Every structure is written in C-alpha cells, then in structure tokens.
Design a protein around this nucleic acid. Sequence first.
DNA 1: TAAATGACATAGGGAAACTGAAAGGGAAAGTGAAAGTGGGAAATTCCTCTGAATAGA
DNA 2: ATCTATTCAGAGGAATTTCCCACTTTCACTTTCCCTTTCAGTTTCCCTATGTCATTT
Lengths: 108, 108, 110, 110
Amino acid sequence: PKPRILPWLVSQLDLGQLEGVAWVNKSRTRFRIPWKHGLRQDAQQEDFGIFQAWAEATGAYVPGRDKPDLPTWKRNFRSALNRKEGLRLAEDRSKDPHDPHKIYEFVN
Amino acid sequence: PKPRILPWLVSQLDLGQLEGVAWVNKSRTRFRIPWKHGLRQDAQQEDFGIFQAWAEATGAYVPGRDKPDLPTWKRNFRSALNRKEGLRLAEDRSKDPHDPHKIYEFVN
Amino acid sequence: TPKPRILPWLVSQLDLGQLEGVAWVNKSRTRFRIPWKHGLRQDAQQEDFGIFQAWAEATGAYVPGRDKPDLPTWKRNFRSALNRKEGLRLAEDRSKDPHDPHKIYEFVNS
Amino acid sequence: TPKPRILPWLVSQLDLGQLEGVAWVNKSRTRFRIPWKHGLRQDAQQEDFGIFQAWAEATGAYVPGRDKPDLPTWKRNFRSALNRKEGLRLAEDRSKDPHDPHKIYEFVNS
DNA sequence: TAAATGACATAGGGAAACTGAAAGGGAAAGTGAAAGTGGGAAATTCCTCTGAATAGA
DNA sequence: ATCTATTCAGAGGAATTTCCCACTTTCACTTTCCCTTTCAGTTTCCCTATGTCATTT
C-alpha cells in the first residue's frame, strides 16, 4: 500500500516513540525533528531515527540487505516535506550545539 | 429488469441523494459528476459513489461478496456514457485540487 | 492515418539511424541503446531528448509550433510506454554517467 | 533571472578582465591568476577579494544592496566549487608571495 | 630599540554532508477507440395431442 | 358390421437457436499522485596556519 508521508509523520508524532520527535504545542501544529548535522563527532545513526524510520517504512531501507546510509535518509526526508503544501519550515535550529533540530508547522 | 444507464442516471440526478452529483441548469440539461483521482490520498471511497451505485445497480457489485474495485466502476461508468448520442462531456474539472468533477451535457 | 505502435516505430528509428546516440548495440538487433542525459545538466539541450520528442511528435502529443515544449513529460511518456510493454526489458542503466549517459533495453520473449 | 554556472562565468570575467590581476597568464588561456591573498593581514579589502565577491554577488548569496559583506565566507564558497571540477586542477599556490599574491589554476582535462 | 618566544583571534582548507529547484521514477489509475459479451427478444427446429383418416377384430 | 386399435397431417406450445443491443472489457498507451535523485553548488565539522599584540633573553 505504501505510506503517505504526512499521515505517517503525524502518527509518529502522536505515538511519540522516537526521541527528539514530538509535538511542541498543545494544539498540535508545530513539531520538532532532531537534526544533528552529519560531520559532528557525537552523531550516530540514532540521530537520524525518523529519517531511518521513513526509509524502512517505504521499503527503501531493509536492515541486512542494504548498508545503512544516513545522508540519503535525511535528504530524502527533507525533500519529501518541502513539496508538501500546508506545511512550512519554521525555525532552523539545525547547527544548534546542544539540541540541534527543526520545527515544522502546518499552515493553510 | 436491468436499468438502462441514462434513465437511471437522470433519476439519481433528480433525487439528488448523492453529494456532488447534481444538475447545474434550472432546465436540467447539464449535470456534474464527482471525479476525484484514485491515487489521491484524499480520495475516500464515497468519491466514486455514482460509479459504485451503478455497479451495485447492474448487480456487478454486491458489497460483502466482491472486493471493492474503484477504478473499474469509474471506468465502466465513463465508457457507458461515451457511446450515448445526445450526451457529451463539456468540461473536465477533474485534476482539480478542491472540487474535482466533470460536466456532461445534453446536445439537443 | 493509423497511430504508430511503439515497438515497431522504435525499431524503425533504430534501423534508419537518423537520431544520434540511438543505435542497436548488437548484430542480432535485439539490444539497443537510448541517450538518456539528465535534464538539469548543463550540457543538456533539446537534442538530448530527440527520441522522446520524436515519439511525442509521432503520436500527435506534440506539434512543433502550436503546442508548448514539455521535455520532461516527453521522456516520462516515452519511458512509461516502454515500461509496461511486454517482450522488452531494461538491461543497463548508464543514465547517470558523465560523457555518455544512456539506458540499454533488450528484446525478450514470453 | 537565470543562475550562472561558475566555470563559464569565471571564464567570462577572465576575458573581460574587469578585476585587477585576473587575466590569464598564457594566451591559450590554460592558466590564470587570482587575487588570492590573506585576511589576517593589513590592507585586505573587497579589492583583494574581488572574484570571491563577484561570485557572491553573482549567485545572489550577497548583493551590494542589502547583505552585509562577509569576505571570509565568500572565500570559503569559491574555494569548494573549484575543487570538485574534474577537468580543473590547482597548479601552484602563489598566494605565498608578498606584494604579488595570487593563485594559478589549470584548464586541463581528461 | 631587538631577534625570539609566546598568546589569542580568526582566516584558510580538505572532506563530506546539506540544500533548493526541478527533473526522474514507480506504479496504480485513466483514457478513447476497438472489439467483446450477456441476456432478453425474435426466430428456427422439436414434441405431444388432436383427430379425422386407416387397419385388426 | 360395427367396434375398437392405430396412425400420419396440422395444432399450440416447448425447446432450443440465432440476433441485437446496451453496456463491458481490451488494447496500448497516457497521466496522475507522491515522492525520489540529480544538479551543481553551499555549509558545516574539525583542524591547521598564520597575522597582530605581549613577554623572553
């Protein structure tokens, strides 16, 4: 059937399984996504969990079959979101030293 | 007593029990048909209500017994109307974002 | 007149060899190649979508002059048409190559 | 407004010779000089970082009508782009000269 | 007023990751023209049954 | 010498058969929706690499 990204993303947000990935508003319209830049030493694949989740979810990534590739999972997650109408990028807290991340918000 | 499509269609148009299926002429010579595209995430089953109604009506589709098949219902409905003389597709508003549909018309 | 069927038409283009880059890759004439340069590249230009364009002109999908040029769509339609077609398969994919980007299709059977 | 590609744009600046000490050295144009100096020195301005500034203005990254000129960043962006070009290698690093600071790239190719 | 030794404040710099805009791709869905189909209607053989015309008793 | 016992035309539906007519399905691509990839550059990250000030001999 293949998941559509917005409904899928919203579900992850509601379940709140991944960390650094949740609703940052009680009305539910703004949300955070970890985004530790790739070159940083403290950066593991645990910091690309949503990106990885999406890849596993769409069949792109299958642990065992393909080597894990972090940059691709991220560029893929990002491009999918950009084209999505009714959803804009708010603040770019990506290079932020302690808690690097981004908040997306649904608009009309 | 299998229904003939034009009389049947006109009846649905007059009863107006199907959202989006309605005349657009006081004179009743132009009607509109809901025409959302199958892939669209926003396509709920009822977006093929007339197509489904015709399939159930010709006894081709009995809920419970058959697996829903939305493409064929629309496909059958469109093909059935095409042979009909005195009837012609006037506008194709189906790749339309908000309210997608097609307008047929009766050539005198 | 009749509308051309894609495989016979393609074979004909291959035999005529009018388009540059489009050629049989073997004597048995069963494997052929199609130039497939990526659209965003700098050296890209309309002549790198010649077969795609030819097919569009051929099916009346495009009419130099009256209609407006949609190069990507020409490729999408040509690519999509072959994809369902039975008895033809994708063999190679050198489409992301630098100097000679192209894909290689092979004719098969059942 | 169409975005310029760096090599064709750079070659144009070299031919026009609008900046001081940019024109190629060899007439066949297989080598050229770049106002590559240093930033932690003394009289370093927008004159010694002209190509770097030209590229920044050219890509809209910076416009002498809003963006507050950052000479250090401009040098970083220009350096990275030249590095990735296959048929383009850096000959010598003559930035190691007092009064005459610069750099010599090659228009080689394989 | 000095060659040297230190002391910070950033400017390079090489890789590899990031990115926006737009082209590519998958594959499920759509299409008009063309050809196929089912089921009810019209038509073309089958079946008693009638019954007057023909044999046994 | 009637008195039944049969029997081959013509009836009046059955029993299929062949036709027709609306839709249905194929045919052979085309298009759409939603993301993915490519392009050709930008931007980090993480270290060095120097170029002005400030103490050693």
